[PDB]
Amino acid sequence: MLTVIAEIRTRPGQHHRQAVLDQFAKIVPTVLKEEGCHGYAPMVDCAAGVSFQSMAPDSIVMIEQWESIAHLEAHLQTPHMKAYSEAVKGDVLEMNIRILQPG
Amino acid sequence: MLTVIAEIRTRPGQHHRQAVLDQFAKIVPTVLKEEGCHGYAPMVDCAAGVSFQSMAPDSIVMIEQWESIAHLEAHLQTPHMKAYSEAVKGDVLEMNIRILQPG
Numbered sequence: 001m002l003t004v005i006a007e008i009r010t011r012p013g014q015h016h017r018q019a020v021l022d023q024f025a026k027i028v029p030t031v032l033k034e035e036g037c038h039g040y041a042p043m044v045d046c047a048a049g050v051s052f053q054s055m056a057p058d059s060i061v062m063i064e065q066w067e068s069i070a071h072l073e074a075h076l077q078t079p080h081m082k083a084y085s086e087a088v089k090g091d092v093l094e095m096n097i098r099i100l101q102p103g
Numbered sequence: 104m105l106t107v108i109a110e111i112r113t114r115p116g117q118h119h120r121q122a123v124l125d126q127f128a129k130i131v132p133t134v135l136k137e138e139g140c141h142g143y144a145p146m147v148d149c150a151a152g153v154s155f156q157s158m159a160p161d162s163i164v165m166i167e168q169w170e171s172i173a174h175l176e177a178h179l180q181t182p183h184m185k186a187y188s189e190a191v192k193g194d195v196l197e198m199n200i201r202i203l204q205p206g
């Protein structure tokens with residue numbers, strides 16, 4: 001029902017983006033098992049050499065589906081997400097989070 | 104009376120941001136003594152590991168208070184500011200300057 005697209009902007013260079021991705025690798029199976037989660041995928045740009053593509057190498061884009069806002073909010077308080085946030089605090093600069101419905 | 108917030112964007116890496124901060128260290132006491140100056144503080148992001156914070160490592164945020172636009176404009180013509188501008192010309196990319204009043 002809700003679709004979340006979250007862009008996580010990482011610090012340039014020094015394998016910061018990979019550090020974050022590695023933290024997601026630890027957590028994604030767990031998140032998929034959370035109540036109300038119907039998708040949770042960290043994505044990165046893939047250079048297709050087409051003129052219409054825009055790329056941001058220092059970013060990870062999450063695509064997620066949650067049954068409700070309550071389920072998303074619960075997600076954010078889980079220990080795996082608190083552990084994730086602590087683990088990536090020196091790697092992440094900001095997040096831009098959209099909550100979307102069918103248009 | 105006027106509050107100025109100026110974001111100074113610096114060149115990535117190569118201690119450019121520190122070079123600029125060092126130039127501010129030279130000038131801040133002088134600026135505070137300028138007529139009509141009631142605050143002049145170069146600030147940087149401080150990573151608090153909270154999800155709601157946005158950080159830009161290649162930026163310095165000035166928070167200032169000036170008694171009037173004339174006082175600010177005079178500030179910009181002082182020798183310490185002309186010397187500052189010359190000193191940082193290879194370190195700074197741009198500035199975004201807001202002049203604010205109580206809402």
Ligand SMILES: CC1=CC(=O)c2ccccc2C1=O
Binds near residue numbers: 076
């Ligand atoms: C604040 C915040 C932190 C996250 O780690 C996070 C992870 C996945 C989806 C959304 C979010 C979010 O809104």
Ligand SMILES: CC1=CC(=O)c2ccccc2C1=O
Binds near residue numbers: 107109165179184200
């Ligand atoms: C153009 C310009 C240059 C500065 O160096 C500067 C320094 C402090 C406050 C404002 C400014 C400003 O508007």
